[PDB]
Amino acid sequence: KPYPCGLCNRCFTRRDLLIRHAQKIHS
Ligand SMILES: [Zn+2]
């Protein structure tokens, strides 16, 4: 899989978790 977040300096596991991370913290 695929999922770097650009708001908090990161790399990742599930998709749904990145969506719930930005859609729960950033916007
Ligand atoms: Zn973040």
Taking the CB of residue 24, how many other CB atoms lie within 10 A of it? 8
**How remote is the CA of residue 10 from the centroid of ligand 1, in Å?**
7
The three-point CA angle 26-5-1 to 5° equals: 135
Rg (CA), the chain: 8
SS3 for the chain is: CCCCCCCCCCCCCCHHHHHHHHHHHHC
Q: At the fourth CATH level, which superfamily is domain 1-27?
A: Classic Zinc Finger (3.30.160.60)
Q: Which residues surround ligand 1, an ion (CB under 5 A)?
A: 5, 7-8
**How remote is the CA of residue 1 from the centroid of ligand 1, in Å?**
18
CB 18 within 8 A of CB 11: no
Q: Specify the resolution in Å.
A: 4.8
Please identify which residue in the block is written with the tokens 């695929």. 2
CA neighbours within 13 Å on the CB side: how many for 26? 11
**How remote is the CA of residue 24 from the centroid of ligand 1, in Å?**
9
CB 13 within 8 A of CB 1: yes
